[PDB]
Design a protein around this ligand. Structure first.
Ligand code: HEM
Ligand code: HEM
Ligand SMILES: CC(C)(C)OC(=O)N[C@@H](CS[C@H](Cc1ccccc1)C(=O)NCCCc1cccnc1)Cc1ccccc1
Ligand SMILES: CC(C)(C)OC(=O)N[C@@H](CS[C@H](Cc1ccccc1)C(=O)NCCCc1cccnc1)Cc1ccccc1
Lengths: 445, 459
């Protein structure tokens, strides 16, 4: 099964028996995709154990996988398990179950439901300022992901359930942060991916990848708790009480971890680029004079704010890779792909490809200016994926993150702390994060 | 009147206005010559009156950036009120305040880079028909009126990319869409109507209740019938789909507003594209060295007459320079106007509520203090070596800010796709009966006096 890419004439690194190419992940997914993107060209194929992975970089071929032939061939992501009752999650469900859940949870972020959440979010934007002010009046370096993670848990627990709890040692933030830790040197996540034929053993043995009593804390909390929660109970009165909790675990983890990590990535670039931070602070004071409260319309008007978010998502795509499982033999864009091959889009490697980005290692929000936005291919820069299975909370996350960036730069400027990791070392482990936590000095205006 | 002394109060120079008429009698040479003479007589800022309407003309790039970009949503949101229009008041180019903001966000995904890339194969069909029609008029020595053949090309591109319908099957030269759209609006200042409603603006609420419209009834009816005929849909995500999916679902888009937006896209796709293409070919015929150098770049990027693609169009640098230099000499917008909705003091200059701030684009594009030899056609100004000396607020052929040309990227792609396939097969020469030098229409809109005719030779 390791002579597949040799048969199809597709270049790639020579795989070792059983292991394949997983020993090249010692530098992480990001550095492995960039090295393979320069050695083999536009299209290459490696092996994750016995699973052949075809990496495509052609924007037209990316469009065929993600958009044109999504409902037909490339419908499901890589099989992940053992998951137990989490198999009913929209990000894990396949085919018919994904179609009914994608359409059910889509009205969660209609232009009306998302506008109902602005008065809910504006409350926690002041607690974020009032908590930073206590660590700003004193000369204490602030761990950004701690204060950003608390704000992210409040928004997702109120915009999806309507409960006010968070905002210190909060039980939701504590159990959600340890919900999953893909440390590739853990023999568990190493084996079940390299040697996957033992997954149905753990399935019939009632085993799961998510901790047992971490799933219990969130399973009984949803049973304890029109929004995201109301949009599903109305359809319940074949959504069962078990598939319901699986979706809440998805929204709580995504609304907390994805938001706080990007915000820390935003604040790091603004501290290492004071000209970008000051130019962004001058724009917020113009659209919102006298520290006016930001509304739904004033956020979309800020052009440079969207250019800073889009550039950071280019430098730090938290998903790193996009994956689709080929469900039947196809010949797309002049290339045959057999059934069972995982078609992967190196999102991290494409965002820094010199063929599509001038000076890619440098932080320049001017790439997304209305003059230069033309030169951006919508299938090379895909921080939220693309097609019918993109980020469902894209318009939610893009709004929720910008709502946090506005209320912070109105009152505080951020400077390095010397103990701040400059340059920022990404975590060469599993998910995308910094090695050392981001710490910055908070000076009040 | 009392208004007629507004600029003397503000200390702003300008021509002395006549009672009632104001300064409209100075339009006998047109908007352009009046703007150039005022720019040379009064300087960076001057004021005049279109009847009783004070118009403040600004030429400072910082003050232009403030009006078009910085203070758009808050102050300079709407253009000069245009009427009577009937149901066309719901058009995006005529809508105001919240209605324009609704329609702008609704029609923005029409021209994304993904949607524009999908239109290249559809445009590639009519590019071959454009050559076959030119080859007939080329195989026999005879002049060729360019706006007629360019207009039939522009109508097919805008009826298929926005609605998915083919209405001009290889011509069909007496196409009803082109015949009615060309007479949709002809602002002739000699016509008392377009001149009297400016002198008596109090008659616009009168003409509206009289069901009188600046657009003829038979043209609006035919365009209103066609959109209802095209709205069956039982295609991919196009301009018509973006209005139907949101119509099927504050709310919403009406049946009359959906026709109003289509007429705007039908007119802009036909008139603006065919007009600029005619000015481009006139400059290439009167400058054979520029035409040869452009043909050499097209043959280098697309050898063996290779079909143009979305990426190969953006690669041609000299083609973009030729399109930009023609738009500099012939800015079809001529003027850029915004209505000051409330009292402001931009760049240290007070502007009262109600004054129409105007940007003389034609005068700024020919200003000697910005361009060297502005009367001459020199595409080398827009080279990447000399583009550092080009102010983005002096050269505004598509406007600037949130209310710029929504079809800028589409018009640039459609014109370049037309110029590529034409110059791949033909070269253009004058024919004596071509008006040299080209006289611009001294009337309202920017057109030539005599139609552009050229001799077409096959390669
Ligand atoms: C900066 C913030 C975020 C980024 C960059 C991001 C990125 C992504 C990406 C790349 C995908 C896969 C798209 C594909 O495979 O084509 C995805 C899927 C998903 N995201 Fe996010 N995400 C973010 C925040 C959020 C938030 C706040 C939520 C809240 C619910 C969320 C919920 C989801 C779900 C449910 C899926 C799976 C959808 C499906 O499988 O049909 N994400 N996200
Ligand atoms: C060479 C071709 C074209 C040129 C030079 C041009 C130029 C302009 C300019 C200068 C404006 C006003 C900008 C401002 O006031 O700041 C405008 C408005 C507009 N143009 Fe174009 N245009 C062209 C072609 C097109 C095409 C093909 C369309 C197709 C739909 C189009 C649709 C519009 C619309 C809808 C507006 C009004 C936008 C609004 O009011 O928000 N234009 N155009
Ligand atoms: C192997 C790596 C580290 C690359 O990842 C995975 O361990 N497992 C992928 C699919 S299983 C995951 C299970 C899960 C995790 C946490 C909480 C609950 C369930 C999953 O469903 N997470 C999507 C939900 C949250 C999210 C995360 C990022 C962006 N938006 C939303 C993870 C993955 C990556 C990219 C797209 C979709 C899913
Ligand atoms: C009368 C003249 C031409 C001297 O001028 C004006 O007083 N009327 C300006 C704004 S009203 C116009 C009304 C209209 C015309 C024809 C059909 C339907 C309605 C309008 O909506 N046209 C924008 C739509 C199409 C277009 C035209 C040009 C560029 N792109 C798009 C005309 C104007 C000038 C410059 C930029 C934008 C508009």
């Amino acid at each position: 099964s390791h002579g597949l890419f040799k048969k199809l004439g597709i270049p790639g690194p020579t795989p070792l028996p059983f292991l394949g190419n997983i020993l090249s992940y010692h530098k992480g997914f990001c550095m492995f995709d960039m090295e393979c993107h320069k050695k083999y060209g536009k299209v290459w194929g490696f092996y994750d154990g016995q699973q052949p992975v075809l990496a495509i970089t052609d924007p037209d071929m990316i469009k065929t996988v993600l958009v044109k032939e999504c409902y037909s061939v490339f419908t499901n992501r890589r099989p992940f398990g053992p998951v137990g009752f989490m198999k009913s999650a929209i990000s894990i469900a396949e085919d018919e179950e994904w179609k009914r859940l994608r359409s059910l949870l889509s009205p969660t972020f209609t232009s009306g439901k998302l506008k109902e959440m602005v008065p809910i979010i504006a409350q926690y934007g002041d607690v974020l300022v009032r908590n930073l002010r206590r660590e700003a009046e004193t000369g204490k370096p602030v761990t950004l992901k701690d204060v950003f993670g608390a704000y992210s848990m409040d928004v997702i627990t109120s915009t999806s359930f309507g409960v006010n709890i968070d905002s210190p040692q909060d039980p939701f933030v504590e159990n959600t942060k340890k919900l999953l830790r893909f440390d590739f040197l853990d023999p568990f996540f190493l084996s079940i991916t390299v040697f996957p034929f033992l997954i149905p053993i753990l399935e019939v043995l009632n085993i799961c990848v998510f901790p047992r009593e971490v799933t219990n804390f969130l399973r009984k909390s949803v049973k304890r708790m029109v929004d995201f929660l109301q949009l599903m109970i109305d359809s319940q009165n074949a959504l069962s009480d078990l598939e319901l909790v699986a979706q809440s675990i998805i929204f709580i983890f995504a609304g907390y971890e994805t938001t706080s990590s990007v915000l820390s990535f935003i604040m790091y670039e603004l501290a290492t680029h004071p000209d970008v931070q000051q130019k962004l602070q001058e724009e917020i004071d113009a659209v919102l004079p006298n520290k006016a409260p930001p509304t739904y319309d004033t956020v979309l008007q800020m052009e440079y704010l969207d250019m800073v978010v889009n550039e950071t998502l280019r430098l730090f795509p938290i998903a790193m890779r996009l994956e689709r499982v080929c469900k039947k033999d196809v010949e797309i864009n002049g290339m045959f792909i057999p059934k069972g091959v995982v078609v992967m889009i190196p999102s991290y490697a494409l965002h820094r490809d010199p063929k599509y980005w001038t000076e890619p290692e440098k932080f320049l929000p001017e790439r997304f200016s209305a003059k230069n936005a033309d030169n951006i291919d919508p299938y090379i820069y895909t921080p939220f994926g693309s097609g019918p299975r993109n980020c469902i909370g894209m318009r939610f996350a893009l709004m929720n993150m910008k709502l946090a960036l506005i209320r912070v730069l109105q009152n505080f400027s951020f400077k390095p702390c010397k103990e701040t990791q400059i340059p920022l070392k990404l975590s060469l482990g599993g998910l995308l994060q910094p090695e050392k936590p981001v710490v910055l000095k908070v000076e009040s205006r």
